[PDB]
Amino acid sequence: NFSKAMSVAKQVFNSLTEYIQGPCTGNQQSLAHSRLWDAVVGFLHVFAHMMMKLAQDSSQIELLKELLDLQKDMVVMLLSLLEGNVVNGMIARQMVDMLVESSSNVEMILK
16 A cells, blocks of 8 residues: 555655745745654655565565655755755755764665
8 A cells, every 4th residue: 555655755745846946945944944854764764674675575566666766756855955055054954964863774775
């Protein structure tokens, strides 16, 4: 039943991307001040474990593809928050701090 959740999850992220795509400073700052970082931490944890689990099973190829496209749409949303970013920026620092907390989960997609 993960297909239904991921399909909706792509639309949420894609809609979020359009909010901040176009150097929309207000939406970039407001989302930074919100609790979006905590949502990504859970998703990265879900992405990390399901990446290895579904890879091991040969019957999960279709679901594994559905997992990747959702994951790519997340980083586009992250890259959309760094449009027009400055050094030591508030949005940039919060993104780095979120990266440190999920470092265990972050350093498993790369492998």
